[PDB]
Amino acid sequence: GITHDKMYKRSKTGAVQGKWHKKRKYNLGRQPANTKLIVKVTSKKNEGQKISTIRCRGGNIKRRALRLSHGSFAWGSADISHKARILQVVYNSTSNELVRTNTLVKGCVVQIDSAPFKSALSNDTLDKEILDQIRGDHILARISSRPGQVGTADGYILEGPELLFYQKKLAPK
C-alpha cells in the first residue's frame, strides 16, 4: 500500500535510486482520515461522533476520528476549562480547502460555543479580549491534539499575541 520508504525518492545529487526490495509492512502508510466537524447536528442526528480504532504495529490501537462534535477547550490564564461544542473551523494555516470542508486537524483555528464559559463573564479583570468573545457566544480557540491519531479534539483558547495574529487574519470578513 502507501509507503513512507525513501527507496522511491531520488538521492541528494538528484540521481535515480535502485529498487532492491519489494514494499514492506513496516514502511506502510495509511489513507488520511479527515475528521469532519458535525455542524449539521440540527439537520440530522444520524451523523454522531464516529471514532474508529485501527490495528497498528505491536497491537497498539490508534483511535481515528471520522466525525467529531465536541472537545475539551482550556482557557490557560483563568484556568477555566469545559467541554465545548465546536461551531466552525475558521482559518487553517496549511490550506483554505480544509477550512471550507471544516476538517478538524491540529492547529486549525476553531470557533467554540461560549455557553459553558458564560460563567466567566461574571468575574471581570479576566482578559477583556476573551470576555467580549464570551459575550458574543463564539470564542477563538485552536485544536491542540491530533484527531486522526488520538481520536479527540482537545484544544486551548487563543490568548495574548496569538489571538491577535488569527483575529487579524479573519478581520476583513
Next chain:
Amino acid sequence: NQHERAYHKQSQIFQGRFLRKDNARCLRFYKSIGMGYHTPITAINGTYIDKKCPFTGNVSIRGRILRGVVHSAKMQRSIIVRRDYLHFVQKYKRYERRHKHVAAHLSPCFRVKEGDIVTIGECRPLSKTIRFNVIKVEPVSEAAKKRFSPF
C-alpha cells in the same frame, strides 16, 4: 504580521504569559546542551523562534560532534559543511585528500559566512539531508585562501 500564514510561538512558552506581570514568568526557553558548549547570549535574548534551534528549540544534540568549514550558507536556515579527511591506501603508501559535504541546520542566532569553522552536532533527522545542527561558529578573514583542513 500578515505575510506569515501561521503564528510561530515557542511551544514551551504559553502565549498567555505575554499578558501582565511579564517579569513573573519566563517568556523565553533557552535549554543548554552540555558537552562543554554554552548557550549564546543571542539565543537567551533572541526574537527568533526556530523549533530546530539546539538552544531555544525542541531538538537534542546527541551522537557524533564534528567540526568543518562552511561550503555554502545560501539555503534558508541551512548550511552545507565541507568535512575534509585523508584516506590511506596500502598499494601506494601515499594518502588521498577527500571531501564530504554534510547538511547542517544554522540556528538564526549564529551568523556564518562561507569559510567559517563550524561545530556540528548530530540530531534527529530534521530533513532528507539534514541530521546535524551548528553549535559553535569560528569566524575567518573572508580572504582566508582555502587550505585542506582536517578539523
Next chain:
Amino acid sequence: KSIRGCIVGPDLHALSVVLVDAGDKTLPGLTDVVVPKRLVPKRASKIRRLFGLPPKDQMLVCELKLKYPKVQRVVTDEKYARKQRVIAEKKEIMRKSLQQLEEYKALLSRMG
C-alpha cells in the same frame, strides 16, 4: 468461491425447507415422529433451569455403564475456596504494597 444467488430458480437441483405452519393436514412423516435430543444439558445453570430450580445438580439423565455428562459451570466446594483464596491473595498484595509505600516515603523524609 462461486455461490448461487438467494433467489429460487429452475436451475436449483436441491431446496432446503423448514415447517413454519402446520395446524391441519398433519404431514405423513414430518409430524409423524418426535425425535429425542441426542445429548442432555451439560451446563449446571441449564440443568437447574431444566428442573426449574432457580450447587446441587449431580443427578442427570443416564444412558446405558450409564454415561453422565461431566457437570459444567457448578461451584464445587474447592472452586468456592479458590475464588475466595485468589480474592484474599490480591487483597494481601494491596496491603503489603501500600505498607511499603508509606515506609519508603518515611525513609525519604528521614534523609530530606
Next chain:
Amino acid sequence: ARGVRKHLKRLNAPKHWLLDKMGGIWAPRPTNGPHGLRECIPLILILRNRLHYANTYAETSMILQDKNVLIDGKPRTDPTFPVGFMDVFEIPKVHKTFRVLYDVKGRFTLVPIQSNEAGFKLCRVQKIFLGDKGMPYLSTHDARTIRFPHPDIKTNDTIKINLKTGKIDEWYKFDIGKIVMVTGGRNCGRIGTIQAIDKHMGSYTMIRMKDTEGTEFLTRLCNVFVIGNDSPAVAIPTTKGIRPDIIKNRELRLRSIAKR
C-alpha cells in the same frame, strides 16, 4: 528476516561456551531470561558439557523436568534456561552447590560454595528509574526489577539479594579502592581494586583496576562488577583473577601433562 530468530549455528555460538566444531550444525540457543545470550551459558551446556551428569540432551530434559537442578534457588526446568554471573546452580540430590563466576581466561566456572554463600546472590544496579506511577525502581544485570530501592544506592553499585526473600541485604558502592571483577571483554575474570575513574563525557567511563601483582588493566565501566568494599564477600575462583601470562600458562600446561 520476517521475525525473531529461534535457532543458533554452532559456529555462531559464543567461544566461551567451548562447543566442538564437529559436534553439530546447531548449538543450544538460550531462552530469554535473567541473562543475555552473550553474557550467559544454557543449562544444557552447564550440565551435559561441564558436569556430564546427563550424557545426552534428552537426559538433560529428564533431570531438568524432575526439578533436580535449582538455579538461584528456583526450579528452572527449561533446558535452554540462561545461567550467568552470580546465579546459584545447586543440585541437592548429588549434594553439590555451585556459584557461576568467570575464570581468568574468560570462560564461566562453576565454583563450589558453602550453604551460607548459597543464600545470598550478588547483583549490579544498571539503572534507577521512576516507572509505574513514578514509583522508584532499580534494574540489576540479572533482569531483576526491585521497587522502593534504598534512596542512597546509586547506579553501578552492587546490591546483594536474599534470594529467599529477594530483599537487598547490603549495597557495595562503585568507587576507587573497591574490589571489582571485570565480567565480559578482553580482560575477563580479572580481580582488582578501582584505581581510576575517567569519565570521557558523552561516551564510556574508563575504569583502570590494579591486580595484587600490580598489573594495571583498563576496561569500560559496564563490564566492571563490584564484589565488595575491601574483600570479595563472595567465593572467587582458585586463580583469584591474578591472570597468568602466556609463558606461565605454557609452564602450567607442561606440569599437568607430566603428572599423567
Next chain:
RNA sequence: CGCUGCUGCAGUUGAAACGCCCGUAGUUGGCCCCCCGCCGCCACGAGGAAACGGGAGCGCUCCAGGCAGGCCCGUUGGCCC
C-alpha cells in the same frame, strides 16, 4: 612479468617529451621559534561473531584431521588475526 613498475619500467636513436607560452583545479613548496593548542603520525589500550589462517599442548597406528585427554592449572581447548 621490474611485459603495468608503490617498492620497481621505459621515452636522443628500439614503443613513446604535448610546436610554443600563459594559466585554474590538482599535486608540490627553502630556512626559522625546543617547551602552546589543533592536525596527520607512531606506540599502546578498550570494545566488536566464530569458522578460517596461524598457533600452545595433546601419538586419530602415522597422516590429512580432530579437540581432545587422562586420575589430571579450578585437566584442557591458551593466545593472535
Next chain:
RNA sequence: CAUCCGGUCGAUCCUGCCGGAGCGCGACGCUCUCCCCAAGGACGAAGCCAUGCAUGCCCGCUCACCCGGGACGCGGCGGACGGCUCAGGACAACGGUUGCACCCCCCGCGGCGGUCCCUGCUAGCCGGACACCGCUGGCAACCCGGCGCCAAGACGUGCGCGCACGGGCGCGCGCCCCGCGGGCGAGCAGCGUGACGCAGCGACGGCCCGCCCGGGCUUCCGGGGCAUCACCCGGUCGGCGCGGUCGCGGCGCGCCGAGGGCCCGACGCCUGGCGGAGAAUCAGGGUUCGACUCCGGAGAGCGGGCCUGCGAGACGGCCCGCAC
C-alpha cells in the same frame, strides 16, 4: 620460501613480445590394489515440472465407544524460524563505528497487581452459540447447503476500592552561564491541578513496567567499470504548517524560497555484478576471485495488493492481471 630458459641474425649485443617451466579448480581422455577424508545441476535456462514427502504438537473442552483407551472437532502455540537460491539491487546491499532526548517487540525472567458512573450484580460462579456430532441433501470433480442436539481457561457481557485511571490535552524551569539531584553529557522523566475521555482486564486474574531477543531507522569511514557519458536533478534542495507511520524524516501534501550535486568524476550508461568474514597464487610489496558452508541482505514464474498476528507486504497463506 628473492631461479629462469628456447625463438628476429652470416654472426653479435639489445629492446620487445611469443613459446615453455610452477600451482590452483573445473571440464575432457586413458587407466585403477586397498583404507581414511570429502565437494557435488552455482558457472548468459531465478528455464520447467509428473510422483512421494518436507509442520506439527497439545488436551483447556469427551453424554464419540474400548470406560477414561480416548477418535474427531473446538481451543492453544508453532507454522515469520529453519531449509533453498543469488534473479534484482552499484552513494544501494554489505563491513567496522554511532545514536534513538524519534522508536516497536512473542517467549521467558524479575517486578507490579486499589480501576468513577447512572442504569443495572448471579458472583456459591451469568448468558447465548456454534464446530464435531446426528438427520437430510445437491455435487463429474472441487466444494459445501439445510435442520436438530450440546461444551470450553473459547465467546459476549459483568460483581472493582473517587491516590478511580489507558490515551491525549491545557497549565506549572530560569533572569548571563555552569556547580544536590528519580536520571543525564544535555529541561529529561515523573507528578500536582484543571477539564475531557471512560481504554484495558474480571466468569480457572492481567492491565502494566524493567530486562531479554529480534526488528525499524540512524551517525561516520570504506563501499565496480566507462569521459566515444561534462554538466546534472526539479519532491530535485531547504523552510513552514498539517497529515501519516512503531516513530523520525519530502515520507506525503499545501504554501514560501532557490537551492542541491559535480574533473577529490556529478549525472548518464553498462555489469556472463549479492556483499563481508574469506579463498587462489605468492621473498617483500601485490594480483585475481568473491554462486556455496558462518554472518547480514534479497527473492520464491512475473508484477502488484491483502488478511491474520507481537512480528509476514508471507507465496509448502489468500485476491487479482499477464505468461504457462
Next chain:
RNA sequence: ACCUCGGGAAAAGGAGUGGCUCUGACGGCGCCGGGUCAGAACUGGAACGGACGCGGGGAUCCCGACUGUUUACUAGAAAC
C-alpha cells in the same frame, strides 16, 4: 532527421476547456480602483473553442534558392 545554425516547428503527437460556489495573487494607504492569471470544491443523458470563427499530417524525388512578376478575356509555370 536535416540545416546556410537563423530554422525545421503549430513538427510529430497528447491532455484539459461549461455552469455555479469560493480562494489566492496584482495597484494608491484611510480610502478607492483593476480585469487579468492561477488554484479548489460542487454539479450536469459521458457535457463545454456546444453557433460562429478556425492547419489534416508524415516520408520522399524532380525543378526553380527565396519575396516578387507574367501571357486583361483558355497556359501563374519549372518561364521572367
